Amino acid sequence: GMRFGTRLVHGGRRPSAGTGDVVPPIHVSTTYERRAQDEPRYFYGRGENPTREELEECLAGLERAPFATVFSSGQAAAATLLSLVRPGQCVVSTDDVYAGTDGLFDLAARQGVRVRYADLTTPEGIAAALAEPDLALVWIETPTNPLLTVVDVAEVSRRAHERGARVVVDNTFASPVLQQPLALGADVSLYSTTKSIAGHADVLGGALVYRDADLHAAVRAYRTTAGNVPGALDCFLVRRGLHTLSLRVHRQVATARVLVERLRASPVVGAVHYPGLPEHPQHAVVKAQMSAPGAIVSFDYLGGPAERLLDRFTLFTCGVSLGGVHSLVECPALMTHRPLSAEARARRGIGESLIRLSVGIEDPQDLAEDLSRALAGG
Amino acid sequence: GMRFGTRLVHGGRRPSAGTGDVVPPIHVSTTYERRAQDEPRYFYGRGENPTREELEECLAGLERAPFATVFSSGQAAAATLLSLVRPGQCVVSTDDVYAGTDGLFDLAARQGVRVRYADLTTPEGIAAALAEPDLALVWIETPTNPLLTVVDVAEVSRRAHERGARVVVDNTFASPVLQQPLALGADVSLYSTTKSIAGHADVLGGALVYRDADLHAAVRAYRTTAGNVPGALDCFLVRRGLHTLSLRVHRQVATARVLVERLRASPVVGAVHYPGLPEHPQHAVVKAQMSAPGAIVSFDYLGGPAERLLDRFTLFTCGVSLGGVHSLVECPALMTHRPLSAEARARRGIGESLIRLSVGIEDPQDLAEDLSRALAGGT
Amino acid sequence: MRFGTRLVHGGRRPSAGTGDVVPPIHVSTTYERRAQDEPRYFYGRGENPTREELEECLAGLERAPFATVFSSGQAAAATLLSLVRPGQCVVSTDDVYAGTDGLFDLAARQGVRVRYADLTTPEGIAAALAEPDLALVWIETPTNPLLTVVDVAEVSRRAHERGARVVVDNTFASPVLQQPLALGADVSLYSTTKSIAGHADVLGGALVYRDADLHAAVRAYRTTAGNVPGALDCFLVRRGLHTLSLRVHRQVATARVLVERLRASPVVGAVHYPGLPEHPQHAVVKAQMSAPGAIVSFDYLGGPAERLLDRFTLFTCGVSLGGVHSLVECPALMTHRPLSAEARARRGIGESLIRLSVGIEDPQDLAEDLSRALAG
Amino acid sequence: MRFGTRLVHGGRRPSAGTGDVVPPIHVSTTYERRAQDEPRYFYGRGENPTREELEECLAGLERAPFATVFSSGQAAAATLLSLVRPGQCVVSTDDVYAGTDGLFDLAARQGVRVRYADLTTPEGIAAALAEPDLALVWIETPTNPLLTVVDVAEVSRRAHERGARVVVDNTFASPVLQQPLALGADVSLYSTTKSIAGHADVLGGALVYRDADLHAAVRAYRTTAGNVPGALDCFLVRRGLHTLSLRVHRQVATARVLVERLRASPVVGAVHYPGLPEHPQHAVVKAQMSAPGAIVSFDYLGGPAERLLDRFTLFTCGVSLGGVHSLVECPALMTHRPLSAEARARRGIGESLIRLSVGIEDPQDLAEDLSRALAG
Ligand SMILES: [Cl-]
Ligand SMILES: [Cl-]
Ligand SMILES: [Cl-]
Ligand SMILES: [Cl-]
Ligand SMILES: [Cl-]
Ligand SMILES: [Cl-]
Ligand SMILES: [Cl-]
């Protein structure tokens, strides 16, 4: 019923009987007295925790979904979902997914899962990939990182469901403020809440948001058995960051747009990548599925060695991760995509001098000035 | 370098040598090894703490000031500043200050401090009040609560300084995002950080921000001896909330303006108080010293008992405090100003049907709809 | 450093500049590259100094070169099991923790062969270790809730002749009472949720070991599976760890008092405790455990177990163990309820078997609560 | 319940509905008024359940009806002192904590009469309590760093004839070892920063008392001066409290061992410890303290204190006390540095007087570190 910004503040904000705490108290207890529960629901912290459930309820509400489950990290959420793929079955994804996701694909392949990478940006590429026998899961990360191409969630989902397959979107990049995979036709939204959801670079976490009750049971059973559960204090921090998610994302987007214009005016910048550009190859898909184009920007630096440029920022921080209040810069070839061969990177279109920006909430003019200073050198 | 929104994120964000943490680690240690420091700076947690210091550096930076000191609560910040006034000396304040401030005034009065209240909104009231002998401190809270009247900080500061007095502004209401007391000529900005600065209703804290080094030494000596220091985990929470202060405040103000228009349109609303209204009795001062008119709104409800109105809200929370992400509603006569007598409230213009809103960051249309449903109800 | 000193100072990394005695809590998920001489901190899932300090402390308690912590005991166990290939064999006992058995089932659905055996007799051991492609021998000792014991040194000897890794789930005893690595095992496994953190306010797991290749594999899996604990959680475990020896010794001393109370009760039948002189593996307990632990179980004779549970006013009725608060449960109604009555009888878990987890309350208060509850 | 049980369960309020054994941490500053059966919780500075639970625990350790906790020990002290009116007189000892003297100085500038006395002699007492408008008698026992002791029961008797309130700053001993209220005092004052929280990771203070009028004044002051602790801090103090008794007894046991080491060292002169038979007030120690504490001091004869301080590799050289980590300091160089050398001379604080605060490390490790330092 409540709109999105209200859901961020009040979703899962369960009342405290007797005392009336507006902010729910933090449930750190690992164990529970059984005899004084009218309807015994709480037994042991790995299985049940009120603070964790409140965060879950909040996240589910952001997508008007019945279910969410949180995890110790984004990788743990992914690993859980992927554990449901059985020997002989096939997962179709794209060869530009997050390295952590690809690492889990590798493990799945050890366990008799056929991993099929595909181009999911053309009708022919989609058609080919989705014809795989025993197709169990289609894995969409959109926008992709660091080239920021997109995949038509609704179209891939329609075609995947004709094959009986489950569709997950890793929605970490966009956050539910900007993109709603379940509304688009997908079955699962996957997040690293470590990024923009928690938003303050001070907690690790993951989440799955979905509607299927059978999936829910399998996911909860796996979390309980594998024990990849987040702590109560961590859930408190994720929940606390969540209040400002909409305000932060919109600030980040507005600034990214400013930085994109700076970049397009620089003599030492080549190609600029941003989902919001009108010449973006999938601009129509961007317009149809994203309420705004996001806070990640990438560009080809032409002024010399990228590693020298990285040392010149005095406001952007050089490091990995994204979505936080502090603006970050990295060079994928030297950092996030370093474990790949130079050949694989060239094949992926990731040039040695491609630079990636994760825009924080600092003043846009300070960020633009820092960027311009770095680019000009001297 | 650093404009305001940048200072919120990076003010006091000291590098971690060796490990390189972007978010500085939380220093919970009460105790320090003497032999492990090049120069002996850290001795004991009550006196020194890096996490507390980082918060202070951030706060000072928001007003481009050399000094800040944080406290276990806003009351503690106020108590510290007040402790500097000697018996036989006089504090001049507005009649409508925070009850906690008045509680501190009463406490000081029993030590021999003279407390004089005055109308600081008129040139005659200012001239009268500042003519009190032994004037040591002029205490300005603006806008006031719950009537949202406004005092000209620059003007009162110019006159107070001619009398050699220190000027403090309780700037909790506006936050440094909207009002800069030191730039307006005051000597000290006082904050309850419990409110908008931390902003998530999950930690108590206070702060003083100022420029005078002698004041700095006196303030720190008192905090150390009185022991009204905040914990490191609390400073961490305040600092974390600070990141989004400007985004929060601007959302809150934009929604407050929306709610003000809903109130004005309602046939069961009498007076509406908001510093942004053209007919606000101090509109010119508001325009001169506040960058936006804030997120507190108050109004007289005409449609029946205040209690019945309060029962009808389903999004606004009925409680005290303000500045947080959750929207709050209160009836001063029944809640915050309940200690005063009925006669005292009348004298102060706080009527039984005066309602106060503290606007949060929820969707403006959800908040507007909740308010309208409440106004239109009748049981 | 001796044991008690290692609890306080293990992993207590100096704060250069400031001199913090208690190391500051590193909550940052991300790291500036240019601020490190030679960069070793990149991202919180991979690296975190607070987590590393806890790991260094834990490793120190067993004089071992390595430790890795996890979001839970289950996650530590899952990590170790992930190194067993389909077709290969894990040998364990049928009375292993239900969570461990849940993980065995998960592994078995990937094609891991799980064989259960009697590891308390030479013939049972010989038959178990005869399994081809034996990769891992999983020892939980003492067992719960009957408190039987497996000879770690003897089983490890035989297992190593077959080239197998040996892990001991040492949660029950803690490293204060039992040192699996010194006894010959390859890995100590812990739910730090229990006695290690000790205050029932944080979930966590740990593996402690000496093999460098194992180390690389365990870390690679934790990074990829993402089953990492939070920094604030590591702080709570580390903080609880300071008093582990003091807590355990209080708990054992009280457990011993409660055992004699139970043996004197006309409404109590069999009493189980690793320290009783007629315990069937008494020789092994003595050679293997410096003290017999803080868990007690007994057969209640005085009426329905639910009514017994309803009569405690100091013991708390709930699961978990090892904490400062004393807990009581009835396995048939609680921990082992998901079993059939037939399976429980075969395991020797009677309908009126009661289990106590002794906390650090005054022993006289606990003894009086117990007697009052028993109503003998 | 008995003492060790009170540490674990004192203030351990039921979580209705959910059943949390460890109570959840109440961080909310504000409360919904319509959701309360009868409005008790309005605002965090005035009311907070986590804080109240800690207060309930602390009161219970002295079988007292009231306790109030503060942001620090100084804040508790400041609160109690605010109740003394200008023109009234506080009597204290010449050697109280420097923070207490700072508060005395603040009070003296408000017009309070401060009088220092020897509360060790019957003459020093009778002279002190003859002060005209005597409102408060301030006892710190044992004293720091010479560890002299004042008879609480005797001073309290005489002070009560004069109608004065009596407080004991009982930080040194903790409620495990000394019960000021049972001894006849009106208030127990604590820095909970020290042994009560016990892990050197939180600041706090507490007052424990029985008088309802005092209770109202104390709460009105705290609410107005706003010297309130945070919820997370109260959680940490409360969590540390569980093990207070176990820790204190470990510390005392080790202190006795260190005292024996000191007595046999040729570079040690006088040794101060309340448990020594030669202690000038040993009878009073025996009557007032269940054990003689965890603090030891001694004269180092081997040269300047720096020579000794630099050699410790286990003891940490820093201020504070009562924590799990053993600490060493030289009062003249550190805690009592602001004093002139003349003032220290008069107080009997020598330039090479050393003070040990014994933690919970293994006693033989601590003894060895001390001997190594002494030997060079
Ligand atoms: Cl859309
Ligand atoms: Cl008074
Ligand atoms: Cl000044
Ligand atoms: Cl091995
Ligand atoms: Cl259960
Ligand atoms: Cl009294
Ligand atoms: Cl005694």
Side-chain angles (χ1 to χ4, degrees), chain A residues 1-278 280-378, chain B residues 1-37 40-95 97-115 117-123 125-342 344-346 348-379, chain C residues 1-341 343-376, chain D residues 1-12 14-36 39-114 116-259 261-285 287-341 343-376:
Chain A
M2 297 302 88
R3 330 294 220 279
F4 195 87
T6 307
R7 293 183 257 155
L8 288 167
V9 177
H10 297 286
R13 198 176 61 75
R14 292 175 331 196
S16 296
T19 58
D21 301 36
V22 171
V23 175
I26 304 175
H27 292 264
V28 292
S29 195
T30 61
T31 187
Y32 303 93
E33 165 61 67
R34 181 127 356 161
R35 301 168 296 170
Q37 291 187 56
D38 281 336
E39 221 73 18
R41 286 196 45 202
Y42 298 87
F43 304 104
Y44 182 76
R46 173 159 30 79
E48 311 79 42
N49 178 283
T51 298
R52 177 171 77 232
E53 289 157 8
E54 289 155 14
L55 173 62
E56 275 159 353
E57 181 175 350
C58 181
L59 290 171
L62 299 183
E63 307 189 37
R64 305 210 186 279
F67 303 121
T69 296
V70 292
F71 300 83
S72 51
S73 67
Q75 286 297 113
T80 298
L81 191 64
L82 214 61
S83 73
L84 311 176
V85 184
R86 306 303 312 147
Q89 295 183 328
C90 176
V91 179
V92 155
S93 184
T94 56
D95 71 348
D96 46 13
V97 288
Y98 178 53
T101 300
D102 207 69
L104 290 168
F105 289 170
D106 291 344
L107 269 54
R110 262 58 146 171
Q111 310 289 307
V113 177
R114 193 167 78 260
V115 182
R116 162 78 150 95
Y117 301 91
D119 180 32
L120 295 187
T121 70
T122 69
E124 52 266 355
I126 293 164
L130 296 196
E132 286 279 9
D134 316 292
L135 178 60
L137 185 63
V138 182
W139 193 290
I140 304 174
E141 192 180 312
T142 187
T144 64
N145 201 307
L147 293 185
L148 321 181
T149 53
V150 304
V151 175
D152 188 331
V153 175
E155 174 62 13
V156 173
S157 293
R158 269 189 295 275
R159 248 78 268 162
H161 289 153
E162 296 177 328
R163 300 276 292 104
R166 171 169 301 145
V167 182
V168 50
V169 176
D170 186 331
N171 197 38
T172 303
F173 188 118
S175 91
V177 180
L178 298 187
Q179 188 165 251
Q180 290 270 312
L182 303 183
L184 292 163
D187 299 292
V188 187
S189 298
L190 151 81
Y191 301 94
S192 167
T193 57
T194 309
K195 318 287 175 69
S196 61
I197 286 169
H200 298 69
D202 59 14
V203 64
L204 300 166
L208 292 172
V209 183
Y210 48 93
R211 63 174 82 80
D212 190 281
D214 286 342
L215 172 59
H216 187 62
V219 162
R220 288 300 178 83
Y222 184 87
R223 190 184 61 180
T224 297
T225 300
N228 49 5
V229 289
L233 290 158
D234 298 294
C235 294
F236 168 78
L237 288 171
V238 176
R239 181 68 188 84
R240 200 202 200 235
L242 250 169
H243 291 289
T244 55
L245 175 62
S246 178
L247 300 183
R248 290 182 282 104
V249 162
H250 295 310
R251 171 69 269 173
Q252 291 169 323
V253 165
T255 297
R257 289 177 149 139
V258 168
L259 298 179
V260 167
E261 291 316 296
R262 275 292 171 111
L263 287 165
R264 286 167 53 89
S266 172
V268 296
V269 172
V272 176
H273 306 292
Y274 187 61
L277 287 164
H280 190 284
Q282 297 94 46
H283 61 89
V285 174
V286 171
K287 177 176 191 141
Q289 76 185 17
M290 298 180 75
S291 53
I296 314 303
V297 179
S298 76
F299 67 93
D300 283 315
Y301 172 61
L302 313 177
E307 50 91 4
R308 288 181 192 178
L309 171 74
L310 292 179
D311 287 338
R312 293 172 195 168
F313 292 90
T314 61
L315 181 55
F316 281 86
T317 298
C318 186
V320 300
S321 200
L322 53 91
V325 294
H326 335 74
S327 288
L328 306 171
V329 55
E330 66 121 3
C331 175
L334 300 172
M335 298 156 69
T336 51
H337 295 71
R338 186 187 177 274
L340 298 166
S341 73
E343 287 66 13
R345 284 196 301 274
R347 268 156 21 196
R348 285 160 166 259
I350 303 173
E352 291 307 296
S353 293
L354 183 77
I355 304 300
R356 187 193 76 185
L357 305 175
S358 171
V359 179
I361 64 172
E362 304 98 331
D363 189 282
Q365 286 318 119
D366 289 336
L367 290 166
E369 284 164 11
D370 192 33
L371 176 63
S372 289
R373 271 197 307 271
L375 296 170
Chain B
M2 289 198 291
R3 289 161 176 93
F4 195 91
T6 300
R7 291 177 256 153
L8 289 172
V9 176
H10 300 281
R13 195 180 63 77
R14 295 175 202 164
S16 289
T19 56
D21 301 43
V22 171
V23 177
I26 307 172
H27 294 264
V28 291
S29 195
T30 59
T31 181
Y32 302 90
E33 163 68 64
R34 171 177 162 271
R35 307 165 292 175
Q37 311 176 45
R41 173 176 168 184
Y42 294 88
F43 305 105
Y44 183 76
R46 174 160 33 78
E48 312 86 41
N49 179 284
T51 291
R52 189 168 68 227
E53 288 160 16
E54 288 155 16
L55 174 55
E56 291 165 335
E57 187 179 355
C58 175
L59 290 170
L62 304 178
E63 316 191 31
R64 307 201 147 181
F67 307 115
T69 296
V70 294
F71 296 89
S72 53
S73 65
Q75 280 303 113
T80 297
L81 189 60
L82 202 51
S83 76
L84 303 178
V85 185
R86 298 173 130 278
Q89 294 183 341
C90 174
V91 187
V92 164
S93 185
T94 133
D95 188 24
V97 288
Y98 179 48
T101 302
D102 211 66
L104 282 170
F105 290 165
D106 296 332
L107 221 46
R110 302 167 214 282
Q111 296 312 109
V113 177
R114 225 155 48 80
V115 182
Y117 304 85
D119 174 28
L120 291 187
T121 72
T122 71
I126 291 159
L130 298 186
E132 216 122 23
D134 316 315
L135 182 62
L137 182 64
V138 176
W139 195 292
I140 302 178
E141 196 185 311
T142 182
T144 62
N145 205 303
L147 295 176
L148 318 184
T149 56
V150 164
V151 174
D152 186 331
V153 176
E155 171 69 10
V156 173
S157 294
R158 274 189 293 280
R159 307 279 84 80
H161 289 149
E162 297 176 340
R163 292 275 297 106
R166 170 171 298 139
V167 182
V168 57
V169 179
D170 191 331
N171 196 37
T172 302
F173 182 122
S175 90
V177 177
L178 307 181
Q179 193 169 245
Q180 292 271 311
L182 303 184
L184 295 168
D187 302 290
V188 187
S189 301
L190 156 68
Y191 298 97
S192 177
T193 62
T194 305
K195 316 289 171 62
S196 54
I197 284 165
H200 297 69
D202 59 15
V203 59
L204 307 166
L208 294 172
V209 185
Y210 46 93
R211 76 176 70 84
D212 186 277
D214 290 335
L215 173 61
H216 190 54
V219 161
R220 289 296 175 91
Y222 186 82
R223 190 184 64 177
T224 297
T225 301
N228 51 2
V229 285
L233 291 164
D234 283 355
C235 290
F236 169 77
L237 289 174
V238 175
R239 183 63 185 88
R240 188 183 204 256
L242 254 172
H243 287 296
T244 53
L245 174 62
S246 172
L247 305 179
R248 288 184 287 104
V249 167
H250 295 308
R251 170 72 266 169
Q252 293 168 322
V253 172
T255 297
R257 288 169 150 150
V258 173
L259 298 178
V260 166
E261 291 309 296
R262 285 292 186 107
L263 288 164
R264 290 172 69 246
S266 173
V268 292
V269 172
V272 173
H273 305 290
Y274 188 64
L277 292 169
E279 79 275 12
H280 184 287
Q282 294 95 34
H283 67 262
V285 177
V286 171
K287 180 182 184 180
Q289 70 180 27
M290 307 180 69
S291 60
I296 306 305
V297 181
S298 72
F299 67 95
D300 288 317
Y301 182 59
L302 302 179
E307 266 183 357
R308 303 278 68 81
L309 177 70
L310 296 173
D311 282 344
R312 294 198 286 265
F313 291 97
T314 56
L315 177 53
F316 280 88
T317 293
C318 185
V320 304
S321 195
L322 55 83
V325 292
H326 329 84
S327 286
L328 301 173
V329 54
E330 185 240 335
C331 175
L334 300 165
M335 298 158 64
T336 59
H337 290 71
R338 189 193 215 263
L340 296 327
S341 62
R345 290 191 233 106
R348 296 167 72 125
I350 305 175
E352 305 305 296
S353 280
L354 184 59
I355 306 300
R356 183 193 78 186
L357 305 176
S358 166
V359 181
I361 60 169
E362 305 92 334
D363 189 286
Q365 205 62 4
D366 284 336
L367 294 167
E369 284 165 9
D370 193 32
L371 178 57
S372 298
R373 279 195 309 275
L375 296 178
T379 64
Chain C
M1 306 181 287
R2 295 172 168 87
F3 198 87
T5 304
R6 290 179 264 158
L7 290 167
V8 173
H9 300 283
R12 198 175 60 74
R13 291 291 188 161
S15 290
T18 53
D20 300 43
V21 165
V22 176
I25 307 172
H26 292 260
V27 295
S28 193
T29 64
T30 194
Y31 302 94
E32 165 64 69
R33 303 299 209 75
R34 307 164 294 177
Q36 314 177 50
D37 302 46
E38 308 216 35
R40 30 173 311 200
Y41 295 89
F42 306 101
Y43 184 73
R45 172 157 37 76
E47 309 81 51
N48 179 284
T50 295
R51 190 166 73 226
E52 294 161 4
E53 290 153 13
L54 172 58
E55 285 160 340
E56 181 176 355
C57 181
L58 289 169
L61 303 180
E62 308 188 36
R63 295 180 160 98
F66 303 118
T68 302
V69 291
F70 295 88
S71 50
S72 66
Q74 284 301 111
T79 295
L80 190 60
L81 265 182
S82 74
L83 312 178
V84 184
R85 303 174 164 266
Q88 281 173 350
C89 180
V90 182
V91 160
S92 181
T93 62
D94 62 7
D95 48 11
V96 81
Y97 171 54
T100 303
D101 209 47
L103 283 168
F104 288 167
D105 290 338
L106 212 52
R109 294 192 220 283
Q110 298 314 116
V112 171
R113 285 190 288 118
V114 180
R115 191 221 144 106
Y116 301 90
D118 183 3
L119 298 186
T120 68
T121 101
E123 325 90 42
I125 288 166
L129 306 182
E131 288 279 349
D133 312 310
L134 182 63
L136 182 61
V137 177
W138 194 288
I139 304 172
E140 190 181 315
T141 182
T143 67
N144 196 312
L146 293 180
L147 318 187
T148 63
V149 163
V150 169
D151 189 328
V152 176
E154 175 62 13
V155 170
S156 291
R157 266 193 296 277
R158 308 284 84 94
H160 288 152
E161 290 174 344
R162 299 272 298 100
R165 174 170 301 135
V166 178
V167 54
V168 175
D169 185 335
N170 198 34
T171 302
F172 183 119
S174 93
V176 179
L177 304 181
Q178 189 169 253
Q179 294 267 310
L181 305 184
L183 292 167
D186 297 295
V187 184
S188 297
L189 156 71
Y190 298 97
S191 173
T192 59
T193 307
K194 317 279 173 75
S195 50
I196 287 170
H199 297 66
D201 56 19
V202 59
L203 297 162
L207 295 176
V208 183
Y209 49 92
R210 70 175 82 77
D211 191 271
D213 294 317
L214 177 59
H215 193 54
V218 161
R219 292 298 178 92
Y221 184 84
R222 191 188 61 180
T223 305
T224 303
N227 52 6
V228 287
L232 289 162
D233 277 5
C234 290
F235 169 79
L236 292 179
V237 180
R238 184 63 193 87
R239 191 193 203 248
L241 205 29
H242 289 287
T243 55
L244 176 63
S245 173
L246 300 182
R247 286 184 286 102
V248 168
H249 297 306
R250 171 69 263 173
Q251 290 171 315
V252 171
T254 297
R256 286 174 148 145
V257 168
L258 300 175
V259 165
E260 298 314 310
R261 281 271 183 147
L262 288 164
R263 289 177 119 262
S265 174
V267 290
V268 174
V271 180
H272 308 289
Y273 187 61
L276 287 166
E278 76 283 9
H279 189 287
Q281 291 101 38
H282 65 85
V284 176
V285 173
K286 185 178 170 185
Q288 185 164 278
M289 306 179 68
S290 55
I295 311 303
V296 185
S297 72
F298 64 97
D299 280 319
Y300 182 55
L301 303 181
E306 318 89 272
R307 294 294 83 82
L308 171 69
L309 296 175
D310 283 342
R311 293 189 303 262
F312 287 95
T313 51
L314 178 55
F315 283 85
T316 295
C317 180
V319 300
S320 204
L321 52 86
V324 297
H325 334 77
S326 292
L327 303 180
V328 60
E329 64 116 1
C330 171
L333 301 167
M334 294 158 66
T335 56
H336 297 74
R337 198 194 197 109
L339 283 164
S340 62
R344 275 193 307 271
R346 291 190 275 94
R347 292 159 175 259
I349 305 171
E351 296 300 306
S352 297
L353 180 66
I354 306 297
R355 184 190 79 180
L356 306 182
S357 171
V358 183
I360 63 179
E361 303 95 333
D362 190 283
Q364 221 56 30
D365 288 340
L366 293 165
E368 288 165 2
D369 191 36
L370 182 55
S371 293
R372 213 159 46 227
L374 292 167
Chain D
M1 296 304 92
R2 293 163 177 95
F3 199 90
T5 303
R6 292 179 270 158
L7 288 171
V8 176
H9 299 283
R12 196 175 63 73
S15 278
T18 57
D20 303 42
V21 171
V22 180
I25 305 169
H26 295 261
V27 298
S28 191
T29 60
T30 185
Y31 305 90
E32 163 64 63
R33 212 206 195 277
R34 299 164 298 172
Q36 295 187 53
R40 175 179 169 191
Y41 295 87
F42 308 103
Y43 186 69
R45 175 157 30 76
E47 309 83 40
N48 177 283
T50 297
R51 191 163 68 230
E52 292 160 10
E53 288 157 12
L54 168 64
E55 286 163 342
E56 181 170 355
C57 182
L58 291 171
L61 302 178
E62 304 186 43
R63 296 182 149 86
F66 302 121
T68 298
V69 297
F70 294 88
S71 52
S72 69
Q74 286 296 115
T79 297
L80 192 61
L81 253 187
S82 70
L83 307 183
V84 184
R85 304 297 302 145
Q88 293 187 310
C89 176
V90 179
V91 157
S92 197
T93 37
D94 196 19
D95 41 22
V96 298
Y97 181 50
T100 308
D101 215 58
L103 287 169
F104 286 166
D105 293 343
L106 281 184
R109 295 172 209 272
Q110 292 306 298
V112 178
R113 195 167 74 252
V114 179
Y116 302 96
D118 196 350
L119 296 185
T120 294
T121 77
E123 300 83 9
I125 291 162
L129 308 190
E131 283 298 339
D133 302 281
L134 184 62
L136 186 59
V137 174
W138 196 288
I139 306 171
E140 194 180 315
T141 183
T143 67
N144 212 305
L146 290 176
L147 317 182
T148 64
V149 166
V150 172
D151 193 328
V152 178
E154 172 67 11
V155 173
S156 291
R157 276 190 288 277
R158 311 280 70 93
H160 289 146
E161 292 170 336
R162 295 275 296 110
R165 169 176 301 137
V166 182
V167 56
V168 175
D169 181 342
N170 192 36
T171 300
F172 185 116
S174 93
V176 174
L177 301 185
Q178 191 168 249
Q179 293 268 313
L181 301 181
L183 291 163
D186 299 287
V187 189
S188 298
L189 156 76
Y190 300 94
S191 168
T192 56
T193 309
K194 321 279 176 66
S195 57
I196 280 164
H199 297 70
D201 59 15
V202 59
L203 302 173
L207 296 173
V208 188
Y209 46 91
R210 62 174 87 78
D211 184 275
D213 292 329
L214 173 59
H215 187 60
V218 163
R219 293 297 179 88
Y221 185 85
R222 186 186 64 177
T223 300
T224 299
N227 49 7
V228 286
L232 289 163
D233 283 352
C234 292
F235 170 79
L236 289 175
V237 171
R238 179 67 186 88
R239 193 194 201 245
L241 256 170
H242 290 295
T243 55
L244 175 60
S245 184
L246 298 183
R247 292 185 280 106
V248 160
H249 294 312
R250 174 66 267 173
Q251 293 170 318
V252 174
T254 292
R256 289 175 152 129
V257 166
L258 295 179
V259 164
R261 284 281 176 129
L262 290 164
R263 290 177 63 180
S265 171
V267 293
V268 169
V271 174
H272 306 291
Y273 186 64
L276 284 168
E278 59 259 35
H279 193 283
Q281 301 97 36
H282 193 57
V284 173
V285 172
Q288 261 180 188
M289 304 183 68
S290 54
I295 309 299
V296 180
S297 74
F298 64 95
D299 290 329
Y300 174 61
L301 307 177
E306 299 90 312
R307 179 161 143 103
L308 180 74
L309 298 169
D310 286 347
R311 293 168 180 170
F312 290 93
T313 51
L314 183 51
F315 281 87
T316 295
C317 185
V319 299
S320 196
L321 52 88
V324 290
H325 330 81
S326 287
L327 299 176
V328 59
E329 69 126 351
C330 170
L333 290 172
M334 295 162 66
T335 60
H336 300 67
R337 190 174 186 180
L339 302 177
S340 63
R344 284 192 303 274
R346 288 187 298 271
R347 292 170 172 244
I349 305 176
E351 293 305 300
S352 291
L353 178 72
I354 308 297
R355 189 194 71 184
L356 307 177
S357 171
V358 181
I360 62 170
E361 303 93 331
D362 181 285
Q364 282 309 293
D365 286 332
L366 295 166
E368 286 164 12
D369 189 36
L370 175 63
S371 296
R372 214 156 40 227
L374 294 172

